[PDB]
Design an enzyme around this catalytic site. Structure first.
Site, PDB file in Angstrom:
ATOM      1  N   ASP A 111       0.845  -1.198   0.000  1.00 42.43           N
ATOM      2  CA  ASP A 111       0.000   0.000   0.000  1.00 42.43           C
ATOM      3  C   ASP A 111       0.885   1.255   0.000  1.00 42.43           C
ATOM      4  O   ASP A 111       0.574   2.248  -0.658  1.00 42.43           O
ATOM      5  CB  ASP A 111      -0.912   0.007   1.239  1.00 42.43           C
ATOM      6  CG  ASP A 111      -2.295  -0.588   0.958  1.00 42.43           C
ATOM      7  OD1 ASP A 111      -2.459  -1.282  -0.081  1.00 42.43           O
ATOM      8  OD2 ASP A 111      -3.223  -0.360   1.778  1.00 42.43           O
ATOM      9  N   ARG A 152       3.476   2.252 -10.994  1.00 41.44           N
ATOM     10  CA  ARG A 152       3.852   0.849 -11.027  1.00 41.44           C
ATOM     11  C   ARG A 152       3.940   0.384 -12.472  1.00 41.44           C
ATOM     12  O   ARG A 152       4.828  -0.379 -12.837  1.00 41.44           O
ATOM     13  CB  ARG A 152       2.808   0.008 -10.267  1.00 41.44           C
ATOM     14  CG  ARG A 152       2.759   0.381  -8.787  1.00 41.44           C
ATOM     15  CD  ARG A 152       1.662  -0.376  -8.037  1.00 41.44           C
ATOM     16  NE  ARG A 152       1.454   0.192  -6.709  1.00 41.44           N
ATOM     17  CZ  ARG A 152       0.490  -0.193  -5.874  1.00 41.44           C
ATOM     18  NH1 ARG A 152      -0.365  -1.172  -6.222  1.00 41.44           N
ATOM     19  NH2 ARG A 152       0.354   0.428  -4.696  1.00 41.44           N
ATOM     20  N   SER A 153       3.009   0.839 -13.300  1.00 36.50           N
ATOM     21  CA  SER A 153       3.005   0.432 -14.699  1.00 36.50           C
ATOM     22  C   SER A 153       4.288   0.901 -15.363  1.00 36.50           C
ATOM     23  O   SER A 153       4.855   0.211 -16.203  1.00 36.50           O
ATOM     24  CB  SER A 153       1.817   1.049 -15.434  1.00 36.50           C
ATOM     25  OG  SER A 153       0.595   0.579 -14.893  1.00 36.50           O
TER      26      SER A 153
END
Ligand SMILES: [Cl-]
Ligand SMILES: [Cl-]
Ligand SMILES: [Cl-]
Ligand SMILES: [Mg+2]
Ligand SMILES: [Mg+2]
EC number: 3.1.3.48
Length: 302
Positions: free
Chosen positions: A185, A225-226
């Protein structure tokens, strides 16, 4: 015997001097700026998850529909690496049909999901795929049927086989859904091992093959993140393709990618993590003693 990779020496110098923020901000300063007029049109307000994350007009993916061809997604084309990726935001309650329409039209074989549906107590994306074989989903607006065929839950990721049917032509296709389920998270993973193993699993599936349309990659905004996933993938590929692997400059590759979608890699920690992933991935691919053992045992099975 002992020989540091050039980005390994760079990494150590940045780490020792504590200058990740400065390095990252310079990349932000130098990043491309292109218009996103379509994304900003009034009628597309409900198609964007974040007001500050939009696809550039020149690289956006267009839906094949006369009404509204807009979807918050960008085609990242890496010439040298011979890799293409569509980076997109996590689908919204009203854009799940568009998402699967894009998958269909672009001939994608895989979807890479890097977030959990709920994180930090909030929804990061809609439940856009079926969770039970017997409960398929029908997207009326784009006339597509989506069915869960199987799913295999591992400790750090889940892989699902999905069947996507164009109800207009009745043609069907199998789509592989690669879901990285353990990105924390907050912050970045402590070790790049599981993320790298995940990338290797997506590669092994054939989903990144030039014979298929571009893999579709998303997290919540489709840039953090991508961005790390595609940046790591492309850097590793270039290191295997070039005569001089030490010439692969992650900062240069990241800027090149940012020509196609804004904001790739959202924090200095994500930049640092991307370096770690490339360095450890390059060593593993090179058959290094240390990285292999700690991998085969725990990173693989167990
Ligand atoms: Cl939560
Ligand atoms: Cl995210
Ligand atoms: Cl940014
Ligand atoms: Mg500039
Ligand atoms: Mg069941």
């Amino acid at each position: 015997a002992l020989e540091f990779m050039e980005m390994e020496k760079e990494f150590e110098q940045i780490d020792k001097s504590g200058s990740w923020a400065a390095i990252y901000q310079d990349i932000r300063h130098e990043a491309s700026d292109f218009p996103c007029r379509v994304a900003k049109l009034p009628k597309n307000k409900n198609r964007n998850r974040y007001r500050d994350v939009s696809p550039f007009d020149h690289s956006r993916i267009k839906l094949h529909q006369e009404d509204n061809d807009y979807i918050n997604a960008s085609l990242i084309k890496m010439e040298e690496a011979q890799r293409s990726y569509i980076l997109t935001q996590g689908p919204l309650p009203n854009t799940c049909g568009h998402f699967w329409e894009m998958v269909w039209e672009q001939k994608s074989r895989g979807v890479v999901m890097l977030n959990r549906v709920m994180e930090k107590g909030s929804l990061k994306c809609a439940q856009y795929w079926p969770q039970k074989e017997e409960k398929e989903m029908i997207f009326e607006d784009t006339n597509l049927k989506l069915t869960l065929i199987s799913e295999d839950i591992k400790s750090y990721y889940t892989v699902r086989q999905l069947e996507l049917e164009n109800l207009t032509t009745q043609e069907t296709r199998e789509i592989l859904h690669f879901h990285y389920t353990t990105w924390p998270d907050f912050g970045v993973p402590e070790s790049p091992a599981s993320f790298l193993n995940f990338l290797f699993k997506v590669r092994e599936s054939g989903s990144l093959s030039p014979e298929h349309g571009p893999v579709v990659v998303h997290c919540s905004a489709g840039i953090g993140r991508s961005g790390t996933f595609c940046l790591a993938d492309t850097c590793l590929l270039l290191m295997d393709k070039r005569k001089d692997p030490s010439s692969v400059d992650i900062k240069k590759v990241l800027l090149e990618m940012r020509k196609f979608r804004m904001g790739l890699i959202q924090t200095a920690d994500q930049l640092r993590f991307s370096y770690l992933a490339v360095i450890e991935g390059a060593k593993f691919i090179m058959g290094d003693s240390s990285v292999q053992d700690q991998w085969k045992e725990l990173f693989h099975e167990d």
